[PDB]
Amino acid sequence: ALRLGFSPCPNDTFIFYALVHGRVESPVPLEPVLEDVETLNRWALEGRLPLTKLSYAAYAQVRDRYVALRSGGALGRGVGPLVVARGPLQALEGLRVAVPGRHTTAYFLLSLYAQGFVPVEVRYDRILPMVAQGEVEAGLIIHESRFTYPRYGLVQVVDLGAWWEERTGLPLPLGAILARRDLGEGLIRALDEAVRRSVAYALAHPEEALDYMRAHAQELSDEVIWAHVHTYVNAFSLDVGEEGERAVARLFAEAEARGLAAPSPRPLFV
Ligand SMILES: [K+]
Secondary structure, eight states: OOEEEOOOSHHHHHHHHHTTTTTTTSSOEEEEEOOOOHHHHHHHTTTTTTEEEEEEHHHHTOTTTEEEEEOOOEEEEEEEEEEEEESSSSSSSSOOOEEEEEHHHHHHHHHOOSSSSSEEEEOOHHHHHHHHHTTSSSEEEEEHHHHHHHGGGGEEEHHHHHHHHHHHHOOOEEEEEEGGGGGOHHHHHHHHHHHHHHHHHHSSGGGHHHHHHHHTTTTSSSHHHHHHHHHHHSSSHHOHHHHHHHHHHHHHHHHHHHHHSSSOSSSSOO
């Protein structure tokens, strides 16, 4: 009955596998809608879905319409987006950089890191080939590209997650699961517990989610699928925690300092 948006990447299908297949209790039935994260980011601007995975940078733009669940998100220290190129670069000034979506946390972090580049916005899976073929000088990559970029002969220019850690001493908030405020407080709290249970179920029976992950990432090898969930699913996926809350506050403080997001007294989490 409730549409639930998330991406077909192994981390999201791993996290929602149990909830989608009735392996854990849910307060209401759910209808998954699998989309690219930038598509979900755009949809959230219109408040389209009542439940949706969203880039944390994008959540900062819809706090009056959505609240973040404490569970199901993507935050951490070794999950940062990377910038890659065909060879070392002195700087990104004046260079074309393929990016996965202007509303992504990846794009926001690249913008904190460097300011003289020319962004070329494309689907994330077009980035590695575009860099290798010389269509752009660098690429901001997310998802499973962090494991496959060497296959394209590329090198890491910067690991923005590491950059963020050095700058803030905190993990990097990448993606969150948001509930539309009009669903009501009780149902939202119940959904937060449901999502936490789904994460815990997959952590306890990972192999059970495998068919579902493959079904939505058919071009990926099982090796890449297992590496992807191992990298992106961690303690923060079960609960943002006190450190994750501090991290999100710092990310939003940086956004507010650049007029990218409007301040709000509303609590960040359910
Ligand atoms: K690898």
